[PDB]
Amino acid sequence: IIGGEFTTIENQPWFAAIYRRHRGGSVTYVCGGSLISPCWVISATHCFIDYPKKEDYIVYLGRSRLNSNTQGEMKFEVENLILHKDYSADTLAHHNDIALLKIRSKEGRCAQPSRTIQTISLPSMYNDPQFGTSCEITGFGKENSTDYLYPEQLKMTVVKLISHRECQQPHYYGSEVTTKMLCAADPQWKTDSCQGDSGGPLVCSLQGRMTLTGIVSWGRGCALKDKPGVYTRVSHFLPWIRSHTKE
């Protein structure tokens, strides 16, 4: 997150922290996620597409710091790693950038909600806030483009939804942005998602409900003028989600 504030998990209880274990015993941070039900975390496919083996991953819930423990945190294995069949990647865009991780602790259980661990509601079919709506992003991503390490402490910021018309101008993203995507940005271009924020929630208040409107997906650089953060438009993937969170 470029700009914004540091935060703690109690303010983003659905936030999931996703890491990968390597040969040798080292763990690196991969991407953020969001708990949508006790056994299910939603994230972005581009996060896993190169290393699709579900045994390499660790998922934390109730976690505020990158490399240290938080009181109340809970650690999960990935029982099932589902990537989108039609996922793809051009120069800038990822298409169908959406993944499902089925989580279970070492004792075979799903998440237990607590003050620091909660689910976030999905949106209803094609029901999005209007443009100019303020929404929040959360992540462990870079605080500056020149950074080579991620912050140790969770951050959040508030961005505004940008119209498809605005986002589809030649000098923005032209036709690279589709209807299955949403743009969001700071009107003064000082706060943004960045590398390492991939997979995390774009949360908007929808009809009085905190709603998972977007998933951090792509963009050109970080807080660049005329270059918004691009997000998977969750409301357009409800059937995909519904079908893979079953049997």
Ligand SMILES: CCOc1ccc(OCC)c(NC(=O)c2cc(C)c(OCCN)c(C)c2)c1
């Ligand atoms: C495990 C991560 O393997 C990846 C593979 C491919 C990847 O993409 C290439 C287009 C990415 N994405 C990024 O590195 C990335 C970069 C930026 C600048 C970014 O912020 C844009 C919004 N300001 C985001 C969200 C992700 C990650």
